[PDB]
Amino acid sequence: NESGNKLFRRFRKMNARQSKCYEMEDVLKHHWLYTSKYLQKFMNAHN
């Protein structure tokens, strides 16, 4: 959860829309995408 806090802090400025209304949804969406094994396993194409 601390590592997730770091990810939250850097996603808040890196890859989320800057607006009080519709930023939190973008952060939640991108973090859910980043925590997806289906996307992560394509980064292990050595077998």
Which residue ranges are tagged as binding site for a divalent metal cation?
A: 2
Compute the distance between CA of residue 5 and CA of residue 27 in angstroms, rounded to an integer: 12
Compute the distance between CA of residue 34 and CA of residue 16 in angstroms, rounded to an integer: 13
Show contacts with DNA in window 6-45 (CB under 7 A): 6, 9-10, 13-21, 26, 29-30
Q: Is 3 in the site for DNA (CB under 7 A)?
A: yes
Coil vs helix vs strand at 44 = coil
Nearer to DNA, 14 or 41 (CB): 14
Number of residues that bind a copy of itself (CB under 8 A): 38
